[PDB]
Amino acid sequence: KVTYIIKASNDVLNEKTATILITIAKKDFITAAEVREVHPDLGNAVVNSNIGVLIKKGLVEKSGDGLIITGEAQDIISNAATLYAQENAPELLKKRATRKAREI
DNA sequence: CCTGCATCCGTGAAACCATATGGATTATTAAGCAAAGCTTCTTTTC
C-alpha cells in the first residue's frame, strides 16, 4: 500500500503524508478538514505539516480551497499501482491475443 | 509723412546583358489518423 507509495516516491515521504496523499489523490479538490476528519490520529498542524511537505514538494497544491496532486505525483501513484499489480494482482496485469494482421 | 485714391488679391454663394538570389513554387517523404477489423466479456434469449 504505502510501501508502494513511499517506495515509488523514492522514500521522500513518510506514512502520514502517504495516506494523506492517498486521500488527496482519492477525491479531487477536497477540503483539508475532510483530510483531518479521515485522519483523527494526526494533529491539525500534523496534517498541515504533511500538506506543508506536499506543497513544499509542489505535488499537492491549492485551487482557491482546492487540494490536488500534479502529474508527477500522479506518475508516482500509477507506478505504485503498477508494482501493486506486479506483486498483488498478477493476473490482472495480463494481455490477450493480438492481430498480425494480413499475410501475403 | 500722411492724408487720400486705386487696385487687387481674398472669399463666400530603349534595349539588352549579366549575375546573383532568394523567395517562391514544386515534389517527396514521414507521421498520423480516422476508419476498419480481430479478440474476449458480458447480456439477452429460450
Short mmCIF file of C-alpha atoms (C1' of nucleotides) in Angstrom, two decimals:
data_model
loop_
_atom_site.label_atom_id
_atom_site.label_comp_id
_atom_site.label_asym_id
_atom_site.label_seq_id
_atom_site.Cartn_x
_atom_site.Cartn_y
_atom_site.Cartn_z
CA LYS A 1 0.00 0.00 0.00
CA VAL A 2 2.10 2.87 1.33
CA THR A 3 5.04 0.55 0.69
CA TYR A 4 4.40 1.24 -2.99
CA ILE A 5 3.83 4.92 -2.25
CA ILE A 6 6.97 5.69 -0.25
CA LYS A 7 8.90 3.17 -2.34
CA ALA A 8 7.57 4.71 -5.56
CA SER A 9 8.42 8.21 -4.29
CA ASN A 10 12.00 7.01 -3.54
CA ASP A 11 11.45 7.40 0.23
CA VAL A 12 10.94 11.18 0.14
CA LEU A 13 7.80 10.76 2.27
CA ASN A 14 6.58 9.18 5.48
CA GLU A 15 3.41 7.23 6.14
CA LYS A 16 1.39 10.23 7.35
CA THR A 17 1.67 12.16 4.09
CA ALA A 18 1.46 8.81 2.29
CA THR A 19 -2.09 8.09 3.44
CA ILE A 20 -2.89 11.81 3.25
CA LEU A 21 -1.59 11.64 -0.33
CA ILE A 22 -3.95 8.70 -0.90
CA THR A 23 -6.73 10.92 0.44
CA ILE A 24 -5.82 13.89 -1.79
CA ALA A 25 -5.48 11.76 -4.91
CA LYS A 26 -8.56 9.83 -3.76
CA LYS A 27 -11.03 12.70 -4.14
CA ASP A 28 -10.28 15.73 -6.28
CA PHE A 29 -10.11 19.20 -4.68
CA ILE A 30 -11.31 18.01 -1.28
CA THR A 31 -11.05 20.20 1.83
CA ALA A 32 -8.28 19.69 4.37
CA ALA A 33 -10.94 19.46 7.08
CA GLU A 34 -12.06 16.21 5.47
CA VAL A 35 -8.41 15.13 5.44
CA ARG A 36 -8.14 15.82 9.17
CA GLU A 37 -11.51 14.10 9.57
CA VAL A 38 -10.28 10.87 7.96
CA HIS A 39 -7.00 11.31 9.87
CA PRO A 40 -8.08 11.63 13.52
CA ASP A 41 -4.79 10.05 14.58
CA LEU A 42 -2.88 13.05 13.22
CA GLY A 43 -2.96 16.54 14.64
CA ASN A 44 -4.23 19.59 12.82
CA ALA A 45 -0.75 21.03 12.27
CA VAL A 46 0.49 17.47 11.67
CA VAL A 47 -1.81 17.17 8.66
CA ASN A 48 -0.97 20.79 7.82
CA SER A 49 2.71 19.86 8.18
CA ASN A 50 2.30 16.98 5.72
CA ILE A 51 0.47 19.30 3.33
CA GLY A 52 3.39 21.62 4.02
CA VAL A 53 5.60 18.83 2.68
CA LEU A 54 3.49 18.20 -0.44
CA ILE A 55 3.21 21.94 -1.10
CA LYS A 56 6.92 22.11 -0.24
CA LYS A 57 7.49 19.42 -2.85
CA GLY A 58 4.94 21.17 -5.07
CA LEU A 59 2.95 17.98 -5.64
CA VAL A 60 -0.35 18.89 -3.98
CA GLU A 61 -1.46 22.48 -4.44
CA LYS A 62 -4.50 24.69 -3.93
CA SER A 63 -7.22 25.84 -6.28
CA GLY A 64 -8.63 28.50 -4.05
CA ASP A 65 -9.75 25.94 -1.49
CA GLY A 66 -8.66 23.21 -3.89
CA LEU A 67 -6.24 20.43 -2.99
CA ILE A 68 -4.93 18.12 -5.72
CA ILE A 69 -1.71 16.43 -6.87
CA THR A 70 0.13 17.16 -10.10
CA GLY A 71 1.04 14.76 -12.88
CA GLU A 72 4.40 13.71 -11.45
CA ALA A 73 2.82 12.59 -8.18
CA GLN A 74 0.18 11.01 -10.42
CA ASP A 75 3.01 9.04 -12.02
CA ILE A 76 4.12 8.04 -8.53
CA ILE A 77 0.61 6.73 -7.86
CA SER A 78 0.42 4.92 -11.20
CA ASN A 79 3.81 3.34 -10.57
CA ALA A 80 2.53 2.37 -7.12
CA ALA A 81 -0.47 0.59 -8.64
CA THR A 82 1.91 -0.79 -11.27
CA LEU A 83 4.10 -2.51 -8.69
CA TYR A 84 0.93 -3.36 -6.75
CA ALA A 85 -0.16 -5.13 -9.93
CA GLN A 86 3.23 -6.82 -10.16
CA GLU A 87 3.02 -8.14 -6.60
CA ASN A 88 -0.65 -8.21 -5.57
CA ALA A 89 -2.83 -8.52 -8.69
CA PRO A 90 -0.62 -10.51 -11.08
CA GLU A 91 -3.21 -11.90 -13.49
CA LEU A 92 -4.96 -8.52 -13.66
CA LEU A 93 -1.82 -7.38 -15.46
CA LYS A 94 -2.31 -9.65 -18.47
CA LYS A 95 -2.66 -9.50 -22.25
CA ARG A 96 -4.90 -11.24 -24.79
CA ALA A 97 -4.39 -12.23 -28.43
CA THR A 98 -3.04 -9.68 -30.91
CA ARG A 99 -3.80 -9.42 -34.63
CA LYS A 100 -0.92 -9.55 -37.12
CA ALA A 101 -2.96 -8.79 -39.43
CA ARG A 102 -2.57 -9.68 -43.08
CA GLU A 103 -0.49 -12.43 -44.73
CA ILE A 104 0.73 -12.42 -48.34
"C1'" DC B 1 4.77 111.68 -43.70
"C1'" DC B 2 0.38 111.42 -44.24
"C1'" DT B 3 -3.71 112.10 -45.85
"C1'" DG B 4 -6.15 110.27 -49.95
"C1'" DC B 5 -7.38 107.36 -54.20
"C1'" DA B 6 -6.50 102.71 -56.98
"C1'" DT B 7 -6.21 98.10 -57.20
"C1'" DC B 8 -6.14 93.83 -56.31
"C1'" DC B 9 -5.89 89.97 -54.09
"C1'" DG B 10 -9.05 87.03 -50.96
"C1'" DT B 11 -13.57 84.89 -50.16
"C1'" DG B 12 -18.08 83.00 -49.76
"C1'" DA B 13 -22.77 81.97 -52.78
"C1'" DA B 14 15.20 51.51 -75.39
"C1'" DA B 15 17.02 47.63 -75.15
"C1'" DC B 16 19.96 44.32 -73.63
"C1'" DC B 17 23.39 41.55 -70.71
"C1'" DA B 18 24.67 39.63 -66.67
"C1'" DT B 19 24.58 37.98 -62.28
"C1'" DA B 20 23.10 36.79 -58.11
"C1'" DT B 21 19.29 35.15 -55.22
"C1'" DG B 22 16.20 34.06 -52.64
"C1'" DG B 23 11.89 33.56 -52.38
"C1'" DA B 24 8.52 31.44 -54.34
"C1'" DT B 25 6.99 27.14 -56.12
"C1'" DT B 26 7.04 22.13 -56.66
"C1'" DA B 27 7.88 17.21 -55.30
"C1'" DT B 28 8.74 13.86 -51.78
"C1'" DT B 29 8.54 11.72 -47.76
"C1'" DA B 30 7.43 10.66 -42.59
"C1'" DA B 31 3.77 10.98 -39.44
"C1'" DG B 32 -0.58 10.40 -38.28
"C1'" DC B 33 -5.33 9.33 -38.45
"C1'" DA B 34 -9.96 8.00 -38.80
"C1'" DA B 35 -11.92 4.10 -40.02
"C1'" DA B 36 -11.97 -0.76 -40.05
"C1'" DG B 37 -11.34 -5.22 -38.26
"C1'" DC B 38 -9.78 -9.32 -34.80
"C1'" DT B 39 -10.33 -10.97 -29.72
"C1'" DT B 40 -12.59 -11.68 -25.45
"C1'" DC B 41 -16.51 -10.46 -21.90
"C1'" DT B 42 -20.84 -9.60 -20.77
"C1'" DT B 43 -26.05 -9.80 -21.98
"C1'" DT B 44 -30.07 -11.31 -23.53
"C1'" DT B 45 -32.96 -15.38 -25.17
"C1'" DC B 46 -35.39 -19.89 -24.97
#
